[PDB]
Design a protein. Structure first.
Lengths: 50, 100, 60
């Protein structure tokens, strides 16, 4: 689980690095990158989905 | 948090950008954008006779404020319904170039 | 069509009323939302251009 944990946080914090450097005036931006990717019916886009 | 009292014009942009993104109220913003384009400026009359337009006060029809997203957040999810595919263009234009 | 009340115009507000049929609901029961309830997350490939300071995501 230790190796699976570092693999997940390293994947997330790397991508949030190059997501923070996009202008709001765009299709896939800071606020609306979760909605277009998700093709299901979750209650709220939070927790494990993001 | 409790109200501070003071705010910069930059802070109002942050308030609008969050409120639209959370509520998915992109078409509601497009209505407000066109509604302000009418009011923002008024003509200086060409001749003295053209002052007749601006004597009587024109009425601005503001819709009643109602929303039920806070109570039932299940109805607003990741797959929203939109009629046009260019339904987020007006906000993306304003947030980039406000003075336009 | 026009309606009056208290010597003033009474206007109809709200959504557009439709002719509800028995078929219009039970076609969504026939549909069932048969999209298998499985959270399939699709990726976005980052694309670099002249500035490089700001990032740009593509669909494929």
């Amino acid at each position: 689980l230790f190796y699976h944990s570092v693999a997940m946080i390293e994947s997330c914090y790397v991508e949030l690095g190059n997501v923070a450097r996009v202008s709001d005036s765009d299709a896939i931006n800071k606020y609306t990158f979760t909605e277009l990717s998700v093709q299901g019916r979750p209650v709220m886009n939070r927790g494990i989905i993001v | 948090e409790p109200s501070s009292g003071r705010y910069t014009h930059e802070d109002v942009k942050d308030a609008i950008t969050i409120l639209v993104s959370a509520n998915q109220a992109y078409t509601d913003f497009e209505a407000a954008y066109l509604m302000l384009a009418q009011t923002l400026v008024s003509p200086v009359p060409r001749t003295a006779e053209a002052s007749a337009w601006f004597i009587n006060a024109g009425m601005v029809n503001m819709p009643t404020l109602s929303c039920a997203n806070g109570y039932y957040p299940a109805l607003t999810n990741v797959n929203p319904y939109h009629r046009l595919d260019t339904w987020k263009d007006t906000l993306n234009h304003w947030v980039a170039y406000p003075d336009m | 069509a026009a309606m009056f009340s208290r010597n003033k115009p009474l206007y109809m507000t709200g959504g557009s009323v439709r002719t509800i049929a028995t078929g219009n609901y039970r076609d969504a029961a026939e549909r069932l939302r048969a999209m298998d309830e499985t959270l399939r997350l699709k990726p976005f490939k980052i694309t670099e251009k002249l500035d490089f300071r700001v990032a740009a995501y593509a669909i494929p």
